[PDB]
Design a protein around this ligand. Sequence first.
Ligand SMILES: N[C@@H](Cc1c[nH]c2ccccc12)C(=O)O
Ligand SMILES: N[C@@H](Cc1c[nH]c2ccccc12)C(=O)O
Ligand SMILES: N[C@@H](Cc1c[nH]c2ccccc12)C(=O)O
Ligand SMILES: N[C@@H](Cc1c[nH]c2ccccc12)C(=O)O
Ligand SMILES: N[C@@H](Cc1c[nH]c2ccccc12)C(=O)O
Ligand SMILES: N[C@@H](Cc1c[nH]c2ccccc12)C(=O)O
Ligand SMILES: N[C@@H](Cc1c[nH]c2ccccc12)C(=O)O
Ligand SMILES: N[C@@H](Cc1c[nH]c2ccccc12)C(=O)O
Ligand SMILES: N[C@@H](Cc1c[nH]c2ccccc12)C(=O)O
Ligand SMILES: N[C@@H](Cc1c[nH]c2ccccc12)C(=O)O
Ligand SMILES: N[C@@H](Cc1c[nH]c2ccccc12)C(=O)O
Ligand SMILES: N[C@@H](Cc1c[nH]c2ccccc12)C(=O)O
Lengths: 69, 69, 68, 69, 68, 70, 69, 69, 69, 68, 69
Amino acid sequence: SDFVVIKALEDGVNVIGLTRGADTRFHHSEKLDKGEVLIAQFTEHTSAIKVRGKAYIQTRHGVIESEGK
Amino acid sequence: SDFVVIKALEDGVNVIGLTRGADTRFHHSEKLDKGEVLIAQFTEHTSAIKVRGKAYIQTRHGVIESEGK
Amino acid sequence: SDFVVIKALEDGVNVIGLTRGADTRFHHSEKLDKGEVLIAQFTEHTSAIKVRGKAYIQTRHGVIESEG
Amino acid sequence: SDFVVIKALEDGVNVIGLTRGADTRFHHSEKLDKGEVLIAQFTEHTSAIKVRGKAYIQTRHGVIESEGK
Amino acid sequence: SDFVVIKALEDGVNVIGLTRGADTRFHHSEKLDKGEVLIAQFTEHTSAIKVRGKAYIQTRHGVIESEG
Amino acid sequence: NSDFVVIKALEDGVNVIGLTRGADTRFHHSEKLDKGEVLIAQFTEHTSAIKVRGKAYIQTRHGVIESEGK
Amino acid sequence: NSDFVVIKALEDGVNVIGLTRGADTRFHHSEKLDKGEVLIAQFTEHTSAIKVRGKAYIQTRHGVIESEG
Amino acid sequence: SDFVVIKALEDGVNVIGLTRGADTRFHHSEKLDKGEVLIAQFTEHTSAIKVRGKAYIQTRHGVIESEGK
Amino acid sequence: NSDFVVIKALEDGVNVIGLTRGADTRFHHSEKLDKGEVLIAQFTEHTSAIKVRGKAYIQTRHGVIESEG
Amino acid sequence: SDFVVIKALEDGVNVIGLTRGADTRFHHSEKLDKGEVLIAQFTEHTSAIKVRGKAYIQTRHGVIESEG
Amino acid sequence: SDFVVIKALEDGVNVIGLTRGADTRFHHSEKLDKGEVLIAQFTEHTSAIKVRGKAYIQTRHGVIESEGK
Ligand SMILES: N[C@@H](Cc1c[nH]c2ccccc12)C(=O)O
Ligand SMILES: N[C@@H](Cc1c[nH]c2ccccc12)C(=O)O
Ligand SMILES: N[C@@H](Cc1c[nH]c2ccccc12)C(=O)O
Ligand SMILES: N[C@@H](Cc1c[nH]c2ccccc12)C(=O)O
Ligand SMILES: N[C@@H](Cc1c[nH]c2ccccc12)C(=O)O
Ligand SMILES: N[C@@H](Cc1c[nH]c2ccccc12)C(=O)O
Ligand SMILES: N[C@@H](Cc1c[nH]c2ccccc12)C(=O)O
Ligand SMILES: N[C@@H](Cc1c[nH]c2ccccc12)C(=O)O
Ligand SMILES: N[C@@H](Cc1c[nH]c2ccccc12)C(=O)O
Ligand SMILES: N[C@@H](Cc1c[nH]c2ccccc12)C(=O)O
Ligand SMILES: N[C@@H](Cc1c[nH]c2ccccc12)C(=O)O
Ligand SMILES: N[C@@H](Cc1c[nH]c2ccccc12)C(=O)O
């Protein structure tokens, strides 16, 4: 299973997991403060991940940055 | 299982999931506001994804950009 | 499973799914307007995909363009 | 499963599927008009694909071009 | 399964499939006229393929040309 | 089997935190690292996300990233 | 499923010979190739070694090799 | 199944195995002296490895060096 | 779907010798090749080691090696 | 299964196998003399290998040298 | 399953197979004379291979030479 690396570039960045299955909703929100790193998998319960705030992102396809505000 | 990365380049980008199976319709529309990133898999319920609006997309195959009206 | 990427370079592009199995026919036609992107897999029900209209297409084998 | 991309370079190109199994015959002819693209897999029912007419073909082994009469 | 691509460089090219199993013979010959392309798999029934005639051949090992 | 991450602690008191796999998300273990220790940690049946706090040098299949403390 | 060998006959009468898989080893088939003909042949339940006699150009996973008459 | 190489740059290096499962504890500590190498797998019982002391370390992602107290 | 070895005989009377898989080790089959013939031989249920006597050009997954008379 | 190459650069190099499982123990020590090569796998019984003495070592991750 | 290529650079080279399992001992010693090539797999019975004497060795990891007494 693939994972995504997320480095928070400011306080209060949110890594949100959406539910796998016929229903789509947020099941969890992980708050990252500046400089913190989260390495997060796709799992049985999480089939999509949303990032809100300024962060540097690595995936198998390369780097992308989310932008706050 | 494969996933796409979607960075909204403007407000109100829509990431639309089409059902796996004999029938084809939309089962969920994730809206993204400017700067937000979504990392989204193909799953048991989603076998085709559609993007409406200005966004920067990465897939196994490289980058593509969606353009809004 | 493999997928194709389709960006509509014009209004009214169709992505057509043909049926998997001993019979071959159209079961669904996804309309795309200019600028819209569809990412679409091969599936239990779709074993061939047809693009009609002006689109930029990426597959595992590279880029190919359909023309109006 | 592998697949092949076929761009029709002229009207009336045919992508023919030959049946898998002990017997070999044509089971379906998809007609393409100039500019239309087909992406078609090898399947339980098709284990060989014939292209008739001028078209641009990509497969895992590269680009090949069919020509008409 | 792997597959072979055959472009007919003249009329009357032959793509011949040999039977898989303890015994060996031709089970189907597919005629290819000049310019026609066949993409053919190895399968439950075909474990070798012979090409007779002038053709352009691609496999996973590269290109090879048959001569008439 | 599954992927792993390399974490070198660039100061004392670095925290490598495992998040629970499954429908609920909580911290189950926090492995503390002092300066210069290396931890090589996998994703597992119990761990489906890892969070790093403090200044550390990180390697994954996607390349290096560095965490920074406050 | 299963490596294959490409054999181009560089003269008439080239022989591609299959050896039997199993505890016992013998020739079970000899496929005659005349000048310019190409044979693409798999390893199989029945054939676990292939011998080429006569002048031919051979491609395998490992490269080209040439047999001499 | 993945493995790490550990070369001890000083006496007393410490390769610590952590238990796989819902509980996390060290279950084995293999000490290395200067110049000794260990090649260790991830296993049914070890899902994380900790290195203490000055060592040179190769994993699939590259070399990393641990530095001691 | 195992590895195979390409052997080209550079002189008459080269010998490709197959050793038995199992607790017991000895030769079960000796294929003689004369100058210029090529043998392409797999590892199999019955052969888990191959020995080449004489002058031949050998290709494997790991590159070319030459056996000498 | 992965394996490792050990060429002893001096007499008396030891390649030690640690047991797979909940318990960790040396179960075999192969002595290598100057210039002898061992190619050894991870197995059902051996899930860690320790090299003691001067040797040149190749693994999937590259070359590393143990020193006496 | 992996294999090793061993070319004898002198007479009396020894390719020695160690037993797979809880016990470790020699079960077969295959002698090579100068110029002979042995291509030998890992197997249900052999999980470690030792070479004595001057040989050129190729594995997945490269070329290593054994030096004889
Ligand atoms: N309990 C969650 C933890 C998690 C993994 N990846 C995530 C991404 C976003 C949010 C939560 C998560 C799960 O197993 O799915
Ligand atoms: N519950 C949906 C969530 C989802 C995943 N990928 C998506 C892409 C588009 C829209 C929704 C989704 C699913 O499991 O499939
Ligand atoms: N419901 C369709 C959706 C789909 C996936 N790929 C397609 C390609 C073309 C048309 C429709 C589709 C299916 O699972 O097959
Ligand atoms: N129903 C057919 C459709 C098809 C797939 N690939 C093809 C190639 C050529 C012609 C038809 C097809 C099938 O599953 O096989
Ligand atoms: N019915 C044949 C079709 C075929 C596939 N590949 C071929 C190559 C040559 C001749 C026929 C074929 C089969 O499944 O095997
Ligand atoms: N050996 C039989 C049956 C057979 C085995 N494999 C085949 C592939 C194709 C056609 C027939 C066969 C025959 O030649 O008739
Ligand atoms: N009936 C033979 C056909 C064949 C395949 N590969 C070959 C190589 C040489 C000679 C014959 C063959 C088989 O399935 O094995
Ligand atoms: N017992 C834990 C060990 C572990 C693995 N990865 C981790 C990451 C962080 C913290 C602990 C761990 C587990 O199997 O999951
Ligand atoms: N019947 C033998 C044929 C063979 C394959 N590879 C070989 C190498 C050497 C000698 C004989 C063989 C087998 O299946 O094993
Ligand atoms: N008995 C331990 C041996 C081991 C493998 N890798 C390790 C890493 C650290 C400590 C011990 C080990 C096991 O199978 O897990
Ligand atoms: N009988 C041992 C032999 C062995 C394999 N790899 C080793 C590494 C070191 C020492 C012994 C071994 C085993 O199968 O595990
Ligand atoms: N019968 C032995 C032959 C063998 C294979 N690899 C070897 C390496 C060394 C010595 C003998 C062998 C076996 O299956 O294991």
